[PDB]
Amino acid sequence: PQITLWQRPIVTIKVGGQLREALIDTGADDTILEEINLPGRWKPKLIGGIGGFIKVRQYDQIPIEICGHQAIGTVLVGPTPANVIGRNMLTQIGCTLNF
Amino acid sequence: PQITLWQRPIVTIKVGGQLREALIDTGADDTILEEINLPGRWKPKLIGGIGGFIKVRQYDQIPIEICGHQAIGTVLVGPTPANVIGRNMLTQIGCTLNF
Numbered sequence: 001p002q003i004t005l006w007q008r009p010i011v012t013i014k015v016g017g018q019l020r021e022a023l024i025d026t027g028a029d030d031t032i033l034e035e036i037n038l039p040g041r042w043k044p045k046l047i048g049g050i051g052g053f054i055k056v057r058q059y060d061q062i063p064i065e066i067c068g069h070q071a072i073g074t075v076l077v078g079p080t081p082a083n084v085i086g087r088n089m090l091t092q093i094g095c096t097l098n099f
Numbered sequence: 100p101q102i103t104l105w106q107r108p109i110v111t112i113k114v115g116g117q118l119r120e121a122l123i124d125t126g127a128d129d130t131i132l133e134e135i136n137l138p139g140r141w142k143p144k145l146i147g148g149i150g151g152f153i154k155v156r157q158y159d160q161i162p163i164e165i166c167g168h169q170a171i172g173t174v175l176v177g178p179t180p181a182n183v184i185g186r187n188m189l190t191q192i193g194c195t196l197n198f
């Protein structure tokens with residue numbers, strides 16, 4: 001779709017067999033989801049944003065469906081205040097900015 | 100322009116008579132700039148992001164040029180680790196997401 005920015009650009013995702021809503025976030029390099037149960041091995045990572053840093057679990061090669069488009073990549077899980085789809089996944093679904 | 104997301108979507112802005120680079124940030128409701136000298140009255144505001152919250156100076160009705168497009172609106176100034184152009188300004192320049 002085309003999405004305008006009068007409201008938060010929230011879309012439906014499926015990840016780890018679970019449905020969630022997430023922000024299309026061009027200011028996010030990586031994809032970060034609130035506590036969600038994902039399978040398998042992970043590595044602890046500290047990431048930084050406005051306000052400071054959080055500890056996340058890094059999961060690699062995680063399949064995700066983003067508004068009906070398929071991607072696979074790194075998903076970081078931790079105490080983010082918002083589920084954010086970052087550029088690592090947005091590049092796979094052909095998402096662009098236009099003005 | 101159209102901007103793809105293989106790299107950070109950074110553009111040149113002019114604000115307060117000064118030139119800066121800033122991220123086109125669809126996950127940002129508001130526009131937040133690192134310490135920059137802006138004229139006139141401001142109101143202290145606490146904003147939240149990943150990692151916690153920052154104190155910012157809120158300036159209203161600030162003109163900004165964003166990659167050659169003119170906007171006017173609220174600009175928050177404070178210890179953000181990145182200059183971010185949020186939806187309050189991106190809607191004025193006709194910025195959309197497309198996939």
Ligand SMILES: CC(C)CN(C[C@@H](O)[C@H](Cc1ccc(F)cc1)NC(=O)O[C@H]1[C@H]2CO[C@H]3OC[C@@H]1[C@H]3C2)S(=O)(=O)c1ccc2nc(NC3CC3)sc2c1
Pocket residue numbers: 025026027028029030031032047048049050080081082084086124125126127128129130131146147148149181183185
């Ligand atoms: C700040 C920006 C530069 C980065 N963030 C992406 C922004 O879009 C976030 C998303 C957000 C929304 C709401 C919220 F409560 C918290 C976060 N917006 C944001 O904080 O908005 C703030 C601010 C703007 O106005 C209002 O709107 C929402 C809220 C409020 C005040 S990030 O989430 O920290 C992030 C994400 C991925 C990532 N991957 C990395 N990978 C390593 C480096 C290579 S680093 C990294 C850092």
